[PDB]
Symmetry: C5
Subunit: 311 residues, 5 copies
């Protein structure tokens, strides 16, 4: 009901911990993720302490209204952290052990440049408002911060749940206070993405390259233009998986390069035909023969240039 | 009111039951499903026992606030279930019969590898928090576990609603307690998936194979490339039914293999033409003649390899 | 307040009525429909009766809390209906007239086999919980069951709003009681489905059949394969209208048959060409000439077989 | 708290007004539209009046619970509106000025036949329930009915916001009362619909007509069939804009006619070829020459027939 | 509890400030954007003032219920702002410092004509209701208005967060009062829109222009018509990025012009062929030779005309 008084000017230390139970709804369209976890809080209140003989027990259980509880909030959430309280335990020395289970949609930006190899740092920002009586400071209890054996992250590898031990104060408000950051490092699992996106997209492009082993302009126009359609169609097919980014992505640059290669292949096919029709088939045959090596080499070279630029 | 006191150290047994009335919203994307069911609770409270002559009746009806009710919760739900109590009945010996109708979105992972023959185990995890006075344990009353004669599961076969009789304790919290698991085993119905997905997808691939019974390179390019487009288009058409998985699925491997076969068929068509144009039609004719058997045989062989790998 | 007492053992009859206002959000995909209607309740309470001279008036108006009201619920809802009470009127003899306006999403399975001629029986299940003092039974007041002159059902014909006069008890609960069923029989209006789905889908198939009046294998491959693409594309176009069913539908069987016909047409075209190239144009010409009649006849025959099988 | 008493038998007049601030979510599918507006209510209560000298002020501000407020509801809404009261002001004579801001989904049928020239009458039905003490009637204060300078109706022309001055009583309930209708007459802006839908759809059809100036059956098959695909593809592209109607629309009839023209064009192309191959090129040339005029003329004629039928 | 009294007739000045923390869910479809920010309020009340020696402290902290707080609301929002308060501080002179954190969906129209060079003026309208005792006016405290060093907007450049210093009164209500406007000027970053939309769309069009360097009518029909399909397909692919506008946009005019160019290119190809077949290949060759320059020149000229018209 009333905040604990400081014996001295020192601020109240609230030890925090988050135990990740379930992580669902990874909607990449809104750069959000839903979380279901345990939030543990630990701080010392002298007013609740006792001798354990006359009191009988070693522990004292209270209701949330009965005692003072710090106003802990999450910064980067859609709406107020949905909560329910599990337990409040007071040890003989006056140390309060608070535990609640919560579920909330977290706002955490995603970098899609490295995609689909990309690594992400998912953030959960904890915050406390200091009162006049008293100031309150947050701390991390590493024993209460953990991932379960049943933790499921389908399509991602969980690297480190290591929260920011030194979380800098956000100078947003009039009074600056330290906001405890929880860094959750993940890296994209990619096996499926080669046989489902890259490989079939390379096959369609390679099919267009058969126009370099043909002399029929009609058959060549069909090869290049119809594969171009198949490529667009294939992009529409995988559209859901690829990201809608306002910046240039690695995947996006490859896609653009593929569009350029269809254009150049058309030029070649058109040129080869023009030379043959304009009575110089020696040149026409030489260009086509060269393209057979030029196109794969330049492609492989440019992909290495791209890979280097992004990694 | 207050919790019932133990005659001895033994924990309070709360007998549970779930009567599955309706199952709506089967989201193959979020791996969540909405449920509307009856939850029944049974436990013995000596405090409310009576003689039926002086009391007149054989049964006593109470309001939820009037008596003690165990705090039963679901583990794998987005948020707390809809709480609408139906009836509370007390027998002369003190046995309480609780019944509520609830509705909640359940988080249950789905394995799409064996799809569309795939079988699933849907989970509903029940949990109770033990108090200081007396510890509380959950049990399954098989007579109160059921699904109606009007239970509709369009597209699935319900194998067994048999809940985990021995549900292991989840070591997540500070105090470990047994969490009653409800395993709902289902198997996918496919009487439609062959004529609607597989058969037309095989037809389009087979059409490309007619290029082995033709010598017109122009007609062949049209056959292979236009069927490749029809295949992509067909995939777009059925896209909704197929799953967007970060791992490799059986269906997904077949699709990939089909993409490979279009690529190889192009190679053949291109090779056949090159040999004919490079004045060796004997080889060209032999390759084409071989492909007529090679392509179906290798396909049938590789499908058997795939089926074996996944089953 | 308290429930009315029975003069004899007879159960309390609650006369019900539903006045269907506007029906919205006909989600064919979730097999749910939203309803906005008036619910009327009528039952006799001797406890509320009076003489109209000393009381002055002929009618007595109460608030919902002031008097006893039966706990009427709907069986098949996503979650409980919106609760808005309009009026409560008591006649001199004690007859209570209750009226509320409600809105709820109803779960009602749909049969898509006969689609798009398909007829449906939409269900709204009313239910009441019978009390230890008096058993409560539901009845239908046909004078209070109706639909307005402004009732709109776009693309459906409303056959009969006739509710189940003898609604069987659901043996789900421990105590079985009669649950008042409201059957709304509807039949699909198709004045659009022929010119928008069937006719253009037949035209595309007929275009492929022109390959039987041509000898150019190149032109024929283009005809059959490009129309096959147009068919897939057309299916994608109308995909929204067609149903995603795990069982075999009439429409779905026709679609499958059309896919088969494109495959057979390819075979013919391929065969005709092979015979001509393998120096037997007499056979090639005979098969093509036969196909001109065979394909339409077999199609028309198989459609009548299909129509017969489904109707 | 209590209703104002009538000096005489006359009913209480509640003057209404709706100030349309922002109209969003124009859902074409469900024929619903979301609205955010101000609702103003004006009625005279003598019990709240005063002298302004002894009271000091000219205006008196109350809280909704403090005074009597009429139970105003909307008929055609998904569910009850948003209850956010802005201000309640009482003038010295006792005239109450009520203002609330609300947001609700309105059910209003749309006629898509005339589309995209189509005109609509959007309805918002206001209703009040008369009490036993004094009957309540609704009125329209034209000075409080309006739309801002910042009112956004992107794609429509607002013809008249003129609410039904004489709104007939809905004979649905047992007691009939006048329900104040708000007619919002709008007409569709088509600045864009010609260059974005009609013109490109005519271009694709016209391209197919070039087959009448060619003799190459191969080139003709490509022209007709590939444009047919382009048409389907184009329909898929504009799918969002076009309406999903269970009845026949003007736009829908044109689309169907276009499908018929592709079929007839195929027939011509097939016939022309057959005659040439069956050694009668004089007839073949005459039909093709005629089609060059026949197709555009018949099209233009049939479009005039269609336009006449719908307008 | 009560509105602060004016020493003279002057209105109460409430100094406002908005500190933009996070800006998410930029759903262009509904022309809405979600905002998460700090709202600061500053005004002087003499009743809360004190001497700081006898009171001890320099600052006084209150609870929202304890003191009078102005009813500040947002005009253009889907629903009410999140009701969450951070701090209330009173200085020795009586100056109140209010701070709250809020999250709401804002309705702000978007102009898509200049897209994707488009620039926008985003609006957040603040409003206050004046009471009987003293009229309340809003002001902007520039020192309490800003965005963090970590604020980043994906795809946009933030030009000026300069709120309307002179915000005109909205004449909607009976009593007109100044509504404080917050203008946020932004310009779209297009670094992606050229390589992802424009460039590949130009490539497909350029491919059709190779028909001017060919004499094969068959190959030309394939070139023009198949690229036209690729264009439609490409539009379907990028459909998400392009806006669904009922007015004419810059991007939309370019798209229309591209459709026209495919039609004209067909005409050329058809004409070239007709002249050759009608035994005048000198004219046919001249037209084709001219088109090689005419088409790119006219295109580049018309694009400059378009750019000029829109900018």
């Amino acid at each position: 009901v009333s905040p604990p008084p400081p014996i001295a000017d020192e601020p109240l230390t609230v030890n925090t911990g988050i135990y990740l139970i379930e992580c669902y709804s990874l909607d990449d369209k809104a750069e959000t993720f839903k979380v279901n976890a345990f939030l543990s809080l630990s701080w010392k209140d002298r007013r609740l302490a006792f001798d354990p003989v006359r009191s009988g027990v070693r522990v004292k259980t209270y209701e949330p209204e009965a005692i003072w509880i710090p106003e802990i909030r999450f910064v980067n959430v859609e709406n107020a952290r949905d909560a329910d309280v599990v337990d409040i335990s007071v040890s003989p020395d006056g140390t309060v052990q608070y535990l609640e289970r919560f579920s909330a949609r977290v706002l955490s930006p995603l970098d899609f440049r490295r995609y689909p190899f990309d690594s992400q740092t998912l953030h959960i920002y904890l915050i406390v408002r200091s009162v006049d009586t008293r100031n309150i400071v947050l701390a991390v209890d590493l024993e209460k911060v953990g991932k379960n054996d049943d933790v499921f992250l389908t399509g991602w590898d969980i690297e480190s749940f290591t929260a920011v031990v030194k979380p800098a104060n956000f100078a947003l408000e009039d009074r600056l206070e330290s906001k405890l950051d929880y860094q959750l490092r993940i890296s994209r699992q990619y096996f499926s993405y080669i046989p489902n996106i890259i490989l079939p997209m390379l096959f369609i492009l390679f099919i267009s390259w058969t126009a370099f082993w043909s002399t029929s302009y009609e058959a060549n126009v069909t090869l290049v233009v119809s594969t171009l359609i198949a490529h667009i169609a294939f992009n529409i097919l995988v559209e859901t998986n690829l990201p809608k980014t306002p910046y240039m992505t690695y995947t996006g640059a490859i896609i653009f390069m593929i569009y350029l290669f269809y254009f150049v292949a058309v030029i070649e096919v058109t040129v080869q035909h023009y030379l043959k029709v304009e009575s110089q088939p020696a040149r026409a045959a030489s260009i086509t023969r060269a393209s057979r090596i030029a196109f794969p080499v330049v492609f492989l070279l440019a992909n290495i240039i791209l890979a280097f630029l992004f990694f």
